[PDB]
Paper text:
Here we report a functional and structural genomics effort that applied saturation-level transposon mutagenesis and next generation sequencing (Tn-seq) to identify essential genes in B. thailandensis, followed by high-throughput structure determination. We used an “ortholog rescue” approach to maximize structural coverage of these gene families, which are likely to be essential not only in B. thailandensis, but also in related, but more virulent, Burkholderia species, such as B. pseudomallei. Using only seven Burkholderia species to select orthologs of essential genes, we solved structures for 49/406 essential gene families, and for 56 total Burkholderia protein targets (including seven ortholog replicates). Of these 56 targets, 25 satisfied criteria for being a potential antimicrobial drug target.
Author numbering:
A (entry chain B): 1 to 408
B (entry chain A): 0 to 408
The structure:
């Protein structure tokens, strides 16, 4: 079995793309949530909150032949992957397209334009905006394919479109593909584009925060006064690479991936089950041949929903006890959906490298319904980790747990 | 210490029926399942009026409402397929499969029509009349995988393989590797699709659809000189994959063993296929099975009946095996069943292998000279006694899959 390391990280997020910009934003303690007055267009959305990207600069040199197939979510994915490849030292590399780099990627949904066009085709038969490019922009695997095609990659495409589990399954399944010798390298990530329908998914479940006048004060993971999540967007990509290969070219190695656990609650489509969530974490620990005691920090899923936070806290307390430091980056960028597992893995590794762990924003009173954990808040925590864990729990009760090993 | 993997359950919902005996009779009777689709006059700009629909489908009566709310048709097909495959594997009424030992790999090209309409219209006009709390789960990329997994309360890993045409074959392949690698003892693996106007527009807008609107019995025509495109079909198919000792220990009837899986992409074009990388996918499978090309007695083509698809596939196959290789396309009967195609074709290929009986490509009367010489079975079924068979599929984005199944005599 091959060992697997991370030699590239990048993305487009509500806090920026470079880590130094993101660190400053984390450190400044304001979230990226805003009012969305344009959503008055939609008939029946309660929430008027989101955490959009502060625009998105499509690079000038991108060729039409390639961009015709991309809506925003695929553009995000590609841009993320471009940044990660540069960071990994592969800018202009001629060899990565030879069939031994593959792509694992997904999103909750394709792009708005073709969803509108195909939906209207059903509604009225009209095909005005249905084109030969509509499917590839809508398709479940739009992100994975667009990323792969963009660098003329010829490896396997692993299409991990599993709503919020998209990015963490990408990482995990890419990791297993390298470990078992199918691919030498993998681009692995997740992405999402913000839209009204993307928000309606959670708003119709009453899972969304409706504090429409106080965007700076919501969401509030594990807080007693939380009232739901806030939807965000963007993408993040990790370059995973077989260990000897990385060593042989003298790559700067950000982390090693040592465990991945994945299961399902098999119970509720939305209402999470703590025991099976805990079991995902155990599976990861078993895969890493580690005791729970080895983990210095957990990066929560931490959506700020009522049941989600309770069930996650119990799952975590069950695996680790009350001593575990934990925080939720969704307090800053919201629930970035398809992107969340990749963005959170990335930032969790950045924090691990620097012995600096961001607090959960807007957590002032720990909800007594949540299990006692070491909820970092108020100020960042200095920890010197050998191992960290990042968890995600998704629609359909799909659970993932990733364990990263420190590399000095 | 890799685990061997066998197939102990097969089933599905298809234009030719569900039971193999029923399907065999249809294959033998040599009529395709293609029909004129007058309803598509509703759509503004479709050239084709052909499809291969299911002749009907009704939910089993004993499916409980609480479990079916989250299903549109494609997920209903997927669940029914998987239900048949589970019975066939001996797991009906057996709840131990829910204990985390069994997982699910599944996908489709698309979610269901209703919520696509509802969300699309929300974008079009802001109206949310028909957007409900159940719309996303019926529309979502992984609707099939999640609905199947939830239906039996399964607690294993979900491997979403929604990759258009490659959905069913990637499901089988990646489920196979999960069992081989020891992550799961069992997996449901399959693919599904529901017929819709939009599903046909995907290919119609590429001019890849047949437009012989008055001659449904005569089209599609894989590898034929007179072919003019594909015909879109629908349905689902599920295989129960199972670790070998586990199967042996409970005395399971074993249909076949999966011995190789190759998966790559062309990295060239979104729709136009590249022969060399298609061949390489076949090689990857052969290498995974530690077999020489010589070992393969038959190839189940993808055989979509498109102009470039059939040429590229033929060359790729000739390049790997030489002119001697027997090959045929089940899409000549049921059309291109999209999400379902890799699973349905895998299933039927194993059924044919078990019986030494290989269906010809329907409506293949003059082999296109632009296609590479292969042993194109046609006119009558061929008797072959195979120790190994291969089933190939090539999809949107240049995604290629090759599966190798070993005879279990
Ligand atoms: Ca290399």
């Amino acid at each position: 079995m091959k060992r697997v390391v991370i030699t590239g990280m990048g993305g487009v997020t509500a806090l920026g793309s470079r880590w130094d910009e993101i660190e400053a934003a984390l450190k400044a303690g304001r979230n990226a949530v805003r009012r969305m007055p344009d959503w008055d267009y939609f008939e029946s959305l309660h929430t008027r909150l989101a955490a959009p990207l502060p625009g998105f600069a499509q690079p000038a040199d991108w060729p039409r032949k390639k961009t015709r197939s991309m809506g925003r979510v695929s553009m995000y994915a590609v841009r993320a992957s471009e940044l990660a490849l540069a960071d990994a030292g592969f800018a202009g590399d001629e060899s990565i397209s030879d069939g031994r780099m593959g792509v694992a990627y997904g999103s909750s949904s394709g792009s708005v334009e073709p969803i509108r066009a195909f939906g209207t085709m059903l509604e009225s038969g009209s095909m005005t905006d249905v084109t030969s490019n509509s499917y590839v922009q809508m398709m479940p695997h739009t992100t994975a394919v667009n990323v792969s095609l963009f660098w003329d990659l010829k490896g396997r495409i692993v299409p991990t479109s599993s709503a919020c589990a998209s990015g963490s399954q990408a990482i995990g399944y890419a990791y297993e593909n390298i470990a078992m010798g199918k691919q030498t390298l993998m681009l692995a990530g997740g992405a999402e584009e913000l839209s009204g329908p993307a928000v309606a998914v959670f708003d119709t479940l009453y899972a969304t925060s409706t504090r429409n006048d106080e965007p700076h004060l919501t969401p509030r993971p594990f807080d007693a006064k939380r009232d739901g999540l806030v939807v965000g967007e963007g993408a993040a990509t990790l370059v995973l690479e077989e260990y000897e290969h990385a060593k042989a070219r003298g790559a700067t190695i950000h982390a090693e991936i040592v465990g991945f656990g994945c299961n399902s609650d098999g119970a509720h489509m939305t209402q999470p089950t703590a025991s099976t969530m805990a079991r995902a974490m155990q599976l990861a620990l078993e895969d890493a041949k580690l005791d729970a005691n080895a983990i210095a920090y957990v990066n929560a899923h931490g959506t700020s929903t009522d049941r989600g936070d309770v069930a996650e806290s119990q799952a975590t307390a069950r695996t680790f006890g009350e001593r575990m430091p934990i925080s939720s980056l969704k307090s800053y960028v919201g629930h970035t959906l398809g992107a969340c597992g990749a963005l959170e893995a990335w930032w969790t590794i950045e924090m691990m490298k620097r012995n600096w762990y961001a607090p959960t924003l807007n957590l002032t009173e720990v909800d007594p319904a949540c299990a006692p954990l070491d909820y970092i808040r108020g100020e960042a925590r200095a920890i010197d980790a050998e191992y960290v864990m990042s968890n995600n729990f998704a629609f359909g009760g799909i659970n993932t747990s990733l364990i990263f090993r420190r590399v000095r």
